[PDB]
């Protein structure tokens, strides 16, 4: 019973779901025993058709009492189309297991057979480019400051200025859903007006936050955004839940509204390196549930970040342990998700961001010395300069200081 959940000769099937875990066993507990235990607890704790199997165990190079375990799970154990069921089974209670000091989930291979039961992003990268009619470059946006205490009218004015000034998107603060000092219905009306009076001669939008306490309230807010002609909405999937996220994603596909996903709680789950769930797992799970855009955060480990960015954009990713990719993942033509870089960035860092992420991305910026429209201008200019330079073949890391209308100058002069 302790063993037989570890079978070193087993070769995975094309339909198996595979997971890679890192762990540190309690002193006295063998690595193999711990591996078998993970497989048992995560699958059974004709049963041979319903049990997971640890097929490979190896030490983590450079770390004492630290091992990897690779476990296969039969396709039949997963509810079609459900992220919630996949996670409930895999990370349900194995993390509380007594023979292990710590456990972290590093990766999941979703077999094609399971990938095809999911909706995937409502639109995806190519569709979004066409819906927005924006090609050849990363998209830009920003948040609005002051955050709290603004009337809907003043908020709308700030949104207006930033969008008119040259940004593609403006984002609601994640902490303002509906508050005593500002109710969502009015924020939505005034923001929509700001878009109307700006939309330039090109499509612009605002990531209205439709995160809500109930499924009904969430739809109610989303429906209002649809009535107002809003091209995009956002949701905090790790605080709201995958059930709610999936529901919203289906709604979005039916109604043609792009969906923006904000990590919003991930540091709770994936920050420490020896416990919990690596972001790249959550990123794959999200791609299957829904969402057209996903915060990835910035780069400016690097390798790990680049790794998941490809996992959520590409159709086929070869395993490469140096980038944190444990299993080859075939996405079976499911559309990708645009990464959104944010935090600690300025026009100053635009060269690097363009070279690192390429064109299929969104760069969100947090003030400029002259109001906000010059802010938007400085970012719009900096980005175009970087894109054209990259097109010319210039080195955006070495020539970045040369690659980067006094709006941009004011920003560069400040720093």
């Amino acid at each position: 019973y302790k063993l037989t959940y570890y079978t070193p000769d087993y070769t995975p099937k094309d339909t198996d779901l595979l997971a890679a875990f890192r762990f540190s066993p309690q002193p006295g507990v063998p690595a193999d025993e711990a591996g078998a235990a993970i497989a048992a607890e995560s699958s059974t704790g004709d049963m041979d058709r319903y049990k997971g199997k640890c097929y490979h165990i190896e030490p983590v190079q450079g770390e004492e009492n630290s091992y990897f375990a690779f476990i296969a799970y039969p396709l039949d154990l997963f509810e079609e189309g459900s992220v919630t069921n996949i996670l409930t089974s895999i990370v349900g209670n194995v993390f509380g297991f007594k023979a292990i000091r710590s456990l972290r989930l590093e990766d999941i291979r979703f077999p094609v057979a399971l990938v095809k039961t999911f909706q995937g992003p409502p639109h995806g990268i190519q569709v979004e480019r066409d819906l927005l009619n924006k090609y050849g470059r990363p998209m830009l946006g920003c948040t609005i400051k002051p955050k709290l205490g603004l009337s809907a009218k003043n908020y709308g004015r700030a949104v207006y200025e930033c969008l008119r000034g040259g940004l593609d998107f403006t984002k609601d603060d994640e902490n303002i859903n509906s508050q005593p000092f500002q109710r969502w219905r009015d924020r939505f009306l005034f923001v929509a007006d700001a878009i109307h009076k700006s939309q330039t001669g090109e499509i612009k939008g605002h990531y209205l936050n439709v995160t809500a306490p109930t499924c009904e309230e969430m739809m109610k807010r989303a429906e209002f955004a649809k009535e107002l002609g809003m091209p995009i909405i956002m949701h905090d999937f790790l605080t709201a839940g995958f059930t709610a996220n999936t529901t919203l994603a289906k709604w979005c596909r039916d109604n043609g509204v792009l969906l923006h996903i904000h990590r919003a709680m991930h540091a709770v789950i994936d920050r420490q390196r020896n416990h919990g769930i690596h972001f790249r797992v959550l990123a794959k799970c999200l791609r299957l549930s829904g969402g057209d855009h996903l915060h990835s955060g910035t780069v400016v480990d690097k390798a790990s970040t680049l790794g998941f960015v490809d996992l959520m954009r590409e159709d086929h990713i070869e395993a490469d342990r140096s980038r944190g990719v444990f299993f080859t993942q075939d996405w079976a033509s499911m559309p990708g998700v645009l990464p959104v870089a944010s935090g600690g960035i300025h026009v100053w860092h635009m060269p690097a961001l363009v070279e690192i992420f390429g064109d299929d991305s969104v760069l969100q910026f947090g003030g400029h010395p002259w109001g906000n429209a010059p802010g938007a201008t400085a970012n719009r200019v900096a980005l175009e300069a970087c894109v054209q330079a990259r097109n010319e073949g210039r080195d955006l890391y070495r020539e970045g200081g040369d690659i980067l209308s006094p709006e941009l100058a004011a920003a560069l002069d400040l720093w």
């Binding site: 050849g136 395993a319 073949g393 210039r394």
Partner: protein, 195 residues
């Protein structure tokens, strides 16, 4: 950027005109886009100017580079005499391989008449092969032949599979149809037909 030996003394407008007129073969003007770019050029603008979209530009540059890396080494002139009209998309998938195994992969891919999907998967059988140091029957498939790397992939994918069921056997028959050594052949015959 390096320019071919013929167009060393043209300006930017000469490059523009020879690009817009297709007045060469792809491996003759693919370096030119790269040099042209340095003198003020953007691919979205170039779609309005020359008229080739950015994906095609990137594919052309990478394909010409791979073709140069092939031709600068041991070979026979027949395949470079074959990579003259429409070889860019196939040269774009073997860019993952180093210069040594590149010329070996090209022979396979142009003899079996394979498309982009097979080329992507094949280069992959080669790239995944080295990190399987310990396995069942690993050293019976050699490394310097692409067919044997692909055959090892197929064999391992059917190796601990379901008892025959014409699924393991089907993958075994796929593996036997691409291998090209002799130890690979007698091992796969030991497996598929009789202990």
């Amino acid at each position: 950027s390096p320019i071919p030996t013929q167009f060393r003394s043209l300006d930017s407008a000469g490059k523009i005109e020879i690009l817009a007129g297709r007045m060469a073969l792809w491996f003759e003007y693919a370096p030119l886009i790269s040099s042209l770019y340095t003198d003020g050029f953007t691919p979205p603008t170039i779609e309005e100017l020359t008229g080739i979209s950015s994906i095609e530009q990137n594919r052309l540059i990478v394909g010409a580079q791979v073709r140069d890396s092939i031709l600068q080494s041991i070979h026979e002139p027949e395949l470079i005499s074959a990579f003259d009209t429409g070889g860019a998309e196939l040269l774009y998938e073997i860019r993952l391989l180093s210069t040594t195994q590149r010329v070996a992969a090209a022979t396979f891919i142009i003899d079996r008449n394979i498309d982009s999907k097979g080329a992507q998967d094949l280069a992959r059988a080669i790239k995944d092969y080295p990190n399987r140091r310990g396995d069942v029957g690993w050293l019976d498939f050699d490394y310097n032949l692409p067919g044997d790397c692909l055959s090892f992939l197929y064999y391992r994918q059917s190796r601990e599979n379901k008892n025959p069921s014409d699924q393991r056997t089907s993958m075994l028959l796929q593996a036997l149809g691409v291998a090209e050594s002799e130890k690979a052949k007698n091992r796969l015959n030991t497996e598929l037909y009789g202990d």
